[model samples]
Target: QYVRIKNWGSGEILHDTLHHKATSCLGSIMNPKSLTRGPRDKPTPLEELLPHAIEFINQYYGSFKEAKIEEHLARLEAVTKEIETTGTYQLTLDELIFATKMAWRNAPRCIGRIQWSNLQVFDARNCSTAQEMFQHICRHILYATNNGNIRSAITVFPQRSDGKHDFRLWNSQLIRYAGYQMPDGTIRGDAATLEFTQLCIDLGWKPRYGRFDVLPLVLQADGQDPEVFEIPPDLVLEVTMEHPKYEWFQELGLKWYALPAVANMLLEVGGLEFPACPFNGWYMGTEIGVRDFCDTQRYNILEEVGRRMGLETHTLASLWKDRAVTEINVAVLHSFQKQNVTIMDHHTASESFMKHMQNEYRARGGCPADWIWLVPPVSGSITPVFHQEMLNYVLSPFYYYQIEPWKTHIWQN
Candidate 1:
């Protein structure tokens, strides 16, 4: 039961025989997540939950090399009683920590799993109001920012208690620039956020009308209408883009927020779902340098940057774009270093991931990786991941993409 994946450049084929031994959802290079309603409609029943809960408990105990059958059985009974009495159950502090780390370790798209064990899991499940949600988010941002020594973190709000009371954050990332349609129809700032920025204005948030303006947090508590709250400017840490060699780069006045916290993902563990968990990790340089700055739908700066470099902008054969993007990547790395921010270059990150992949395979016999995402956008063949064949799969205690709350929200009359 093995599949062969081939690398066109190296003409080498990989026989993935380990997937048959994998204990979770099996996937290959052939897959994907999109915005949509969650699969379950109501709370999972006790009958269905007990089995998964026991499985999770077994996995957790197994991590400690325990035959603590007595401890395991006691915990299982406690969870069963809790679920039977309240229609839902809570994970113990240790279990919550284990689940979050395992979710990070199981993520197929992340290249930074080597740092998975270093996450700070913030428990905000007691949150009850939109304002309290805002407070917790701010605390998360401040802690993760760490004055540019960024830390990986996740703040989990209450679990989905009945589909109607699900708490959610509408923003894709905790920090993002607002986009505005000008009078002449030109979009200013990050064009990708145009629709979301419009939604913020509709919610009574006034625009600062500038490039790199931080959008306010749009939070939905207890299935109510989303409320907009401005992210405090002081809490935000931004790095101004500049080059060590090209002083002209600093003149462009481009800057990006230092932290990269994803705010709209759902966390699933042991038959429980947290619809309002926000998580973060320090960014890999190419994420900002290649995709954010150069993607046509984003800042779209390659052409202009190429012209500034005096390259033949009209000819792809001239490889001017390649030359320009290299400098852009350099500028991104340089700026972050110059500002004393935590960022990893593609080359080093690729190496670290390779080592991590080896460790995972030796420890568990398999590691889930989406090769398409694992490869660097700028220099695919040059990175080790591009040459490595991988199996992409989904595992328990995973972070999942959720439908945009606005799409399925019910309005109060």
Candidate 2:
């Protein structure tokens, strides 16, 4: 007789509960409320709505299995009926599209709509009732047509004031759902955090950006040249499973662990590495403390282990902080001649800043050339250090030089 084995009778419920708990934990850990969307008001502009609508459609469609399309159609019909009963009227394609856009714009924030636009491609004036709007929304969704120009007629709209034509139909939804707001009302760090962290993990080292608590030390010939090393590729790319404040997993929690996973996937799956440097680590406060806490142990072990092995053993703080300074000027100067913003000043500052940055770089007895810079913007508003251009300035080099080794490790061929 054949016997069937079940993992657990309540496995499905347990899995769902665990999934919910994990998601809730992530939400709490990230704390979106603490982040604020800066400058931009609630409810993104209408011009920005189409992309979100596309995103919603794409996501919904992607999750839809052909076998379940009938079920989905039924659900959609039921929803329409519910709307009719409430006297809310069914949604038209145009309105559905609009709602998709609105959802993206209002995502991560409860505020529905805050700004207005003069551009009116769809005249709501003629649509006397909610039923009309519902019809417009549904038609757009079903046959992808409105007034018969080709359902894609909405693409003829004018570009934004900035000159970049928004082509992302799906990305808008991603931005709405995934985007974060900082406390001061600026979008949380761009989507690059995940990318950055993955880079470190592939390289088999901790990732950091800016000045973290830890510092690296480098020793050159003639004891006279002792210097501290910054993490190779200055951008901090960390992945931690736990919050940074946790007692045991604090320093190298989610931020630290994610890097290796990213690096491995990219190099192995993507078949690429440095010249792509791909990953970098930042010095975290806790990681720094851990380094300091283990200083005696590191010092005792360094000579015995040598460079390659020693690099792994040193604590992030001990490796990064010994050379930390109160100020290392990285300025974005307006170029009087070029009339556009240029990295010349950053380069100039880097030349000077390198001395101070390097002092800390070598003092920790690590390697040189680890300190790198991201390129700077040639024009526009001067952003903070965390900005993407600034991040690129510091990290581009790592991607250029360091990713190859990581790629090799992944292939083992």
The local distance difference test score of model 1 is 0.86
Clashing pairs in 1: none
Candidate 2 lDDT by residue in tens digits, 1-413: 21121212222111111111111002323323222111111323433343333333343434434656665565455544643454223334443334333222222211111111111233222332323333332332222221111222111111111112110111110001012233465433223333333443343434343212222211111111122223332222222223212233323221221111011101100111101001111122222222212233321212222232224335654543222210011100111112221112333333333233223223322111211122122211231211211000111001111222222221222
51 in model 2: Cα distance from truth in Å?
27
Q: Which whole-number lDDT from 0 to 100 does residue 63 have in model 1?
A: 84
Each model's lDDT:
0.86, 0.23
**Clash totals for all candidate models:** 0, 98
Which residues of candidate 1, in runs, are more than 4 Å off?
1-41
Off by over 4 Å in 2: 1-88, 109-312, 320-413
Question: What is the Cα-based TM-score of model 2?
Answer: 0.17
Top candidate on lDDT is 1
For model 1, what is the error of residue 133's alpha carbon versus the real structure, in angstroms, after optimal superposition? 0.6
Cα lDDT tens digits for candidate 1, 1-413 = 66775555457565655466344333432324431227455767778777777788878988876478788879888888887788778899899999999989988789999998999999999998999999999999999999999999999999887677889999999999998888898878899999989899988999888888999999989777788899999999999999998989988888999999999888888878899999999989999999999999888999999999999999999999999999999999999999999999999999899888777766776677878788889888898788888887677778888877777777784
